[PDB]
Amino acid sequence: KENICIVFGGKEHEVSILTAQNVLNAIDKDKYHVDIIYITNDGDWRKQNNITAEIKSTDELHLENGEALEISQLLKESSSGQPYDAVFPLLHGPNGEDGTIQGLFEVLDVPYVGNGVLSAASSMDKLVMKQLFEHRGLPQLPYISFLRSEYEKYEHNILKLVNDKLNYPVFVKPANLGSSVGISKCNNEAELKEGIKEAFQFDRKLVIEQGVNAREIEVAVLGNDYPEATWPGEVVKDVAFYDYKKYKDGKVQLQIPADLDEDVQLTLRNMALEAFKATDCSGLVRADFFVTEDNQIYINETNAMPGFTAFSMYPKLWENMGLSYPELITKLIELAKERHQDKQKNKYKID
Amino acid sequence: KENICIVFGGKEHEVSILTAQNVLNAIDKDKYHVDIIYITNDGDWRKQNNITAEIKSTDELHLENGEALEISQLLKESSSGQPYDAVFPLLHGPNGEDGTIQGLFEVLDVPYVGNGVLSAASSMDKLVMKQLFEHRGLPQLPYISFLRSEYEKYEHNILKLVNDKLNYPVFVKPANLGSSVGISKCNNEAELKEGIKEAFQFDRKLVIEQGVNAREIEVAVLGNDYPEATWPGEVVKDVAFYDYKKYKDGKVQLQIPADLDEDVQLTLRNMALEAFKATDCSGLVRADFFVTEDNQIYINETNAMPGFTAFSMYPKLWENMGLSYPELITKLIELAKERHQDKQKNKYKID
């Protein structure tokens, strides 16, 4: 058996916990020895050893009453007594996909699924992500950015650059948040200024982005050095608007593949690979696009740890390619093994 | 008293250990309670509690025989029984300035000196660093970059782009190393190809850089949101060459301020601040420039944790401004406190 540890929760949990239930029930307990570590909202790490049956309800998860050892000892050793072959972060904290847990994993020399430090961190900062996309030549909506320090001195002058380079309406976006906290849509300077002031309560760096009305199209990418991209998918919505949040009850309504011309789909698959390379991803990414009704394409953002329930977009895009959810989980673990092995080979060849 | 922890060593140590001796002997043991954690080449963490006298020889450091508790307990609590007010990483491992230890620090919610995760990681990847410098408008030598995957398919085609955009000689540079391992200077394709092949043994991503002969000029930057830059300094060298390494015995020979026109110095101070902002630095950075004999300026790289002995360039640049080495250490701790406090204020205002 191989030795796996799923880390879930994070310093709101209900998605992460549902995800960890799905990932657990889709792992062959015959091929894998599975421990899990739950991170409480407090930040405390609680381990639960040796999952061996299906998790039918969240009650079966020890959660905050798990075994409360130091984080060092929790990750060094499987309950089986072997070191882990892969650790799978399914976190919904900021420490989830800002590169921080990945940094911990590297310091502890623990092999792990998904994106590395620089990749996760730069996909979480919206300014760095766009700067990397730009250098790579991917099309994006016209955009501006600045630090609070610059706006305190150049308010009047920054607003002019907005009206020259962009067309209203624009969106004010905090650079470093994982949440819709502080985003607003502004139809003029008056609203823009109010919006900028309003976002600086939550962040020190802002992106101003030209608005579009467009379809949201997502592509799943999987791999390390030779990644592959799925056919695109769509969350079907008769009306494009920024909701600020999923309000409709029940399952989300996916269309996979998306109802797009076959040429446009191929363009999006190739753009997804470019977006993966532009932030030097590992393991996986979801590329999220804006596609207007006249088939104009912009890349919106990448997502370094995308939604990963059994009905989420990222796994359902791979199902459409023939890759089962249990096969996808196993592939992510093998990629984690390979990236990890490739680093001692380099750390060795450095002598 | 405030509570400080110096982390030094790292998974070669002699500079880091000399540095930790200097930083220790320059801290007022009356104002600060000082513990230190030593990271062995093995990666093991060993704590030594409550430094209270001058460290006259490295023998007085417990080093690898320090107290061998789990890393979690080592950082959570000062020997005094209080949580730390600041942790000061003085590491010479890759885990030093690739953002990994900083990620650990954030996961453990430990306040810490210097650059954050994204800042350290992006200053260590030479491709991302140049891409950020470019977007900011700082002048750099003409350069190319590619992944191993791209060169395996486009060898012939990538070499042409080199000869069109650059002028020989060029330097082949691994993107992700902190070491001179795999750098070479090439006067033609024949050498370039050999050089590219030679660097791929140690890295998966490369930068090809146009060579210059120039003076090396360094500027020290200190601050968080309102940073300040020193007058520039110079390691004086009658002959510009890439040494691959300091060979001369004894002290390095600094000229502070550098023998440059007063206008050129002011330009470099302002470029240093731009370079700090371009990678969203915190705490400090050293901006390293190429300045030709005809006063043409290029930024070479930033250094997120620069040399920090008492005779290193970064502290000596601040001494020239009137800031003593003990005052600089204290300023770095206050900045660590401020960045840390500013994050709960935001994490609070996010509700």
Numbering used by the authors:
A (entry chain A), B (entry chain A): 3 to 13, 16 to 249, 251 to 356
Question: Anything the authors wrote about it?
Answer:
Ddl is essential for staphylococcal growth and produces d-Ala-d-Ala dipeptide which is incorporated into peptidoglycan to cross-link the peptide side chains of neighboring glycan strands. Ddl has two d-Ala binding sites and one ATP-binding site, and DSF experiments were conducted with various combinations of these ligands. We demonstrate that acetate anions bind to and inhibit d-alanyl-d-alanine ligase (Ddl) activity in S. aureus.
To gain further insight into the mechanism of acetate inhibition, the X-ray crystal structure of a Ddl/acetate complex was obtained using co-crystals of Ddl and acetate. The crystal diffracted to 1.9 Å and data were consistent with a P 2 21 21 space group possessing one molecule of Ddl in the asymmetric unit. One acetate is positioned within the adenine binding subsite of the ATP binding site and the other acetate ion is positioned in the second d-Ala binding site. The acetate ion in the ATP binding site interacts with the side chain of Lys177 and the backbone nitrogen of Val216. Also, the methyl group of acetate forms van der Waals interactions with the side chain of Leu145. The acetate ion that binds to the d-Ala binding site forms a bidentate polar interaction with the side chain of Arg291 and a hydrogen-bonded interaction with the backbone nitrogen of Gly312. These two residues are conserved in Ddl homologs and previous structural data clearly illustrate the crucial role these residues play in d-Ala binding. The acetate-bound structure shows conformational differences compared to the previously published ligand-free and ADP-bound structures. Interestingly, this loop is well ordered in the acetate-bound structure described here, which gives the first view of the S. aureus Ddl ω loop and the interactions it may form with substrates or inhibitors. The ω loop is shifted towards the ATP binding site and repositions the conserved Tyr246 side chain within the ATP binding site, which likely hinders the binding of ATP.
